[model samples]
Target chain A: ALLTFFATDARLDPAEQDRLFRRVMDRTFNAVSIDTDTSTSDTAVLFANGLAGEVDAGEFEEALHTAALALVKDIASDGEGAAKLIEVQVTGARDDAQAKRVGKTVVNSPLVKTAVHGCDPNWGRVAMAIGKCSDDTDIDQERVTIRFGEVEVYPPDDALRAAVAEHLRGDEVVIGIDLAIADGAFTVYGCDLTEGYVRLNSE
Target chain B: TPRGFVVHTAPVGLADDGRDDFTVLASTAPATVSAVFTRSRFAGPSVVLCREAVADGQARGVVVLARNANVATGLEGEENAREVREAVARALGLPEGEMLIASTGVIGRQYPMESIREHLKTLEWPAGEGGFDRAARAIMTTDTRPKEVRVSVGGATLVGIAKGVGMLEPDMA
Candidate 1:
């Protein structure tokens, strides 16, 4: 992947510019995944001509982050053989790193992805995914809460299963997980696993 | 108002079956630049070259070669990439160190230098709008469509162009 960014009329110094670009790219990568495979040619470059004049650093960073996040979603939704976009939100973790890991692990889970593709309210797969991170995150099942959009399904009940299933049929699926540990939170983007994915890779 | 930037795409026949797979983006003058590259231990020579070129935080142009990643071809690949970078720098009338290069697509093959050189001879510095759109399409490999974003912040305009499809979990360093 290659991403080239052009920002005109900025007043950031070289050090400040490099730091801001790296920070934005790191956060952007933390928020996306597809097949959990890293590329050997992934490159992102930013050119700030500083032609126009000076601008507020805070505003510049905000605008850069917004643009990068938009592109991140585009890449995720366009994953090979993808039918729908999946967004996983993790909150109440021990730290930002832990929250991000939990979010990525859930979004990258093939079972969870397939469930979302089939519109199955199998919240257990979400639980199983979080469980895999127990050693690294020290997560507790009793303290974990899961939801499909606004409908909570962690306590495991059929009362909201139909609603959760309905939510999955859309072009975008949102899965929310709260570790109930702390205020740390993160969100990651991915796509549902379908037979199309297999077909695309089979060749 | 002039945007002070120009972009161009050339059909360099870099693909196995010969396709237009080369694009260039350049500023009218030198620009402050920052970049991040793949952390793969086996990163291609293009990534290595860009890493060294951008260390001074300055660049005048960028060139991308799609298909034939030019990776894992050992010393010959490095020489080939450096030769292309120098040629591009000379063509753009910029110092060799002021040009950045990137490559993507199937790995472990050297670049088709003959086709690239032939196309480079016909390269032109056309200035105007729609260059971004053309560059975006030319850089795509397996991407279903072009990806781009444009926004204005603090009275300045920012535009981004990106392309990727498979083997794309980015662990940039």
Candidate 2:
């Protein structure tokens, strides 16, 4: 019955699960479909297999991970008609939950979400979400690496998109921030906000 | 007609409840798949149909679903579901019983044959990404906004659309 346990992660709410299902389904039911996820309410199960390390389940785990990541990427791509894919990767946590906590904290913060949304690449917002996480007592601020996908905005590289104001007026915004202090690594996927997201969510 | 299959949908507005909406997909890589329902007791007609039909995992391009008709109708309901999909198979040029079905709308309601007929009469498969707009429209069931999206990534084109805004959770999540 480990299935029951994994089916509902205390971390996820029902609406999140529902949105996740629709993300997957949208993958399948598309015109020139990439067939991402089946629906918004997909569930997972584990048998313990009596063989945790017995062997790999082929590529099942990878497929699941990729599907989840891709679906989230699709969410960003489709995030109210956004023009970019901005991701924040969290790492070096005391546990998986903590890393994910920090990852989601930064990725979902209206500041960071909006920065990437506005293509402002505001590193301060990223810092704020990380510092405010529920389990960030051990956070090493000096070690934080802020990457906007391939472009490193902090430790400022010449290839920054646009910081504080200017952003990709004509490109897909990809935010790739790396948190190296967590026990494991996690990436939160999302897209820049378009007028459409504003219009859709506002009403 | 790049990919031949049945297309279906239901009541498309804020006023009426809807379910079992259907449409065929086409692209550079077309897909045809079979579903396996869970052993959970709360399973619906769509689940039972998938479990029984294409049981051996051999699918023949038929997907069926009933509208919001789940609430443990037990064996008899499952049997009726089989009969309906079997009928779909005969009519849609597929092997009898090869069709799969799903249900949504007012759960526990008997299959609405009259409304089903009226909706099916207006069915049409997606022509291209252009139909992205309509597929989004077809899925509406109390949605506050049109559930649809389109984009391009690394030269690959992508689009998505959905309904059931506040009605259901992400079926994939």
What does DockQ come to for candidate 2?
0.08
lDDT of 2 by residue, A21-126 (tens): 3343333222111111223222221111111122122233333233334433443454444556555566566665666566656655666656665657677787
**Alpha carbon RMSD to native, model 2:** 11.5
lDDT of 2 at B86: 58
Q: Return the lDDT, model 2, position B65.
A: 33
Write down the worst ten-residue block by lDDT for model 2 chain B.
B164-173
Q: Each model's TM-score, in the order given?
A: 0.94, 0.49
Q: After superposition, how far is residue A87 of candidate 2 from its true place, in Å?
A: 2.9
Q: How much is the lDDT of residue A44 in candidate 2?
A: 22
lDDT of 2 by residue, B97-165 (tens): 444554434445555545544545554443433354544444333343454433322222233333332
The worst-scoring run of ten residues by lDDT in candidate 1 chain B lies at: B1-10
TM-scores of chain B, in order: 0.93, 0.56
Give me the displacement of residue B44 in model 1, in angstroms: 1.0
